[PDB]
Ligand SMILES: Nc1ncnc2c1ncn2[C@@H]1O[C@H](COP(=O)(O)OP(=O)(O)NP(=O)(O)O)[C@@H](O)[C@H]1O
Ligand SMILES: Nc1ncnc2c1ncn2[C@@H]1O[C@H](COP(=O)(O)OP(=O)(O)NP(=O)(O)O)[C@@H](O)[C@H]1O
Ligand SMILES: O=C1c2ccccc2Nc2ccc(F)cc2N1Cc1ccccc1
């Protein structure tokens with residue numbers, strides 16, 4: 357509705373490449389409101405290839421859906437520009453994606469942060485399930501860091517408009533089946549990424565051979581910091597039978613309980629020197645970079 | 652809790668935005684320790700106060716400014732007392748409302764002007780609830796977060812440290828009395844600034860002559876776009892009897908009433924296309940730079 361803004365190409369500018377994925381390239385950009393002098397930082401995603409205006413109508417229809425999400429842990433699509441190559445606008449996250457964040461702060465991340473991130477990602481996916489929106493490309497690279505205390509899911513629904521083998525449920529690899537329960541499989545891999553501080557899953561195994569090892573019962577290994585309870589949640593996300601996997605609602609509760617006693621469920625060297633920010637640092641971050649309400 | 656104490660090594664001044672009577676404001680960057688991000692901030696290096704102040708006294712006063720909670724009042728965010736007194740607040744890329752109205756002279760619709768009057772009155776009424784006297788209210792001390800959302804700034808600076816004769820109530824000029832009712836006078840001048848698109852009040856008249864012309868009953872003239880209804884509000888703000896002036900609570904009500912029929916109370920050429928932004932453009936502004944939501948815009 358009024359949730360998605362249609363932008364003129366003349367009101368924004370690319371200033372820096374942030375990266376590229378399977379579906380396009382993301383830029384740091386500036387929005388210049390017409391008739392104003394200000395330059396507002398934004399993220400711009402230029403799709404991999406140019407689309408006909410017939411295809412644009414379909415891109416537009418789904419863009420309205422993605423612009424309609426309202427949840428503190430889900431990124432909302434903000435605008436679109438229907439140039440020959442479609443350009444999409446969302447809020448710029450200066451901290452980048454959670455995968456890069458955990459790699460940059462490897463070891464230096466306390467159990468309180470890791471478990472809270474699992475809670476927040478589960479909340480965002482539970483919301484998407486409520487909307488009947490299947491992500492299809494959940495991974496640590498598609499969780500953005502708004503502040504170190506507040507992460508948000510991005511890039512949902514993109515994959516079905518326009519293949520991350522090592523994050524997909526077996527049935528998605530074999531039969532192109534994508535459901536909320538196959539998203540749960542990808543959730544488990546995302547948690548594994550966090551708990552290993554950004555390790556590549558199935559490192560050294562060709563993607564063409566992942567489905568065979570999954571059929572034989574092979575799974576991602578137990579991260580060194582994960583207790584039996586944390587790793588069992590992850591293993592349950594990877595059950596062959598999709599209906600045997602946990603619900604995102606169940607995951608919220610499980611990780612919330614664990615986050616109330618983090619040192620019991622993650623064993624991290626020097627965890628006693630790491631910290632969840634002080635109310636002083638929490639208020640400062642919010643006023644500067646995060647004024648949306650959240651738990 | 653509310654006021655962050657900063658190390659000088661976690662922020663840097665980048666550019667002067669301007670200076671007033673109380674210090675210099677910079678566009679700056681906050682660099683969280685152990686992080687790689689650089690977050691734009693506003694940094695104000697205060698000049699020296701005319702009275703001696705201990706570090707604790709400065710901190711105690713800063714905490715009061717950090718404790719305000721209202722959508723139309725800027726909150727002090729951080730402080731660094733090593734070098735000079737340096738304060739950190741949110742950077743407003745649109746700048747102050749005075750510069751904004753001058754920059755969009757004759758291009759501003761009645762809904763914007765009247766809603767700004769509502770929002771400033773709301774912020775001042777909150778400050779009055781907290782017993783905080785501004786002493787330096789003016790269009791330059793209303794900041795634009797978005798064109799739809801303005802916020803009062805720089806309250807309390809004048810009493811912490813050491814000029815704005817043309818914005819001060821008569822009792823402030825003559826006897827240095829500063830109250831919430833003298834703030835109402837300055838509010839009246841601020842409204843006059845907006846309605847004249849940023850004209851200098853008493854232009855070409857020395858400040859030494861302001862009290863004389865006020866005592867003789869002369870006031871700032873009626874802005875061309877103002878109906879008498881709006882101009883009467885300004886005149887009431889400038890009554891010699893301080894207790895006779897409107898209360899900020901009354902100003903909220905009156906200007907909110909006018910904003911429900913904006914073209915009835917302001918006469919602006921081409922006013923019909925200068926409406927408040929569409930729900931599409933409001934959501935875009937809010938998501939990008941104003942997640943505080945509460946624009947507080949009463950609409951025709
Ligand atoms: N809103 C954003 N703010 C800041 N950085 C972003 C934003 N969106 C994406 N990025 C980054 O831009 C780069 C490109 O992301 P993207 O194009 O989605 O590829 P990807 O997420 O790594 N792989 P995939 O999404 O599965 O195709 C990544 O480094 C992201 O972390
Ligand atoms: N938070 C802010 N974000 C952006 N610009 C700001 C901010 N605070 C102040 N400024 C601007 O920085 C300049 C310096 O402001 P300031 O030092 O308060 O002088 P002044 O407000 O014009 N006069 P006065 O406050 O009465 O002494 C002005 O151009 C302001 O508009
Ligand atoms: O590409 C997309 C995107 C495009 C079309 C349909 C769904 C999509 N999924 C999505 C969901 C929420 C969000 F907030 C951003 C996206 N994005 C990523 C994006 C968009 C603009 C700028 C940078 C990145």
Ligand SMILES: O=C1c2ccccc2Nc2ccc(F)cc2N1Cc1ccccc1
Pocket residue numbers: 676693694695712713716724725726727728738739740804805806807808811
């Ligand atoms: O100086 C001050 C300020 C300093 C001391 C006491 C009161 C003060 N009043 C005030 C109130 C709210 C606000 F949000 C900012 C201020 N400011 C202005 C400022 C601070 C940091 C950077 C730029 C400008």
Ligand SMILES: [Mg+2]
Pocket residue numbers: 377497498510511
């Ligand atoms: Mg992505």
Ligand SMILES: [Mg+2]
Pocket residue numbers: 671791792804805
């Ligand atoms: Mg000022």
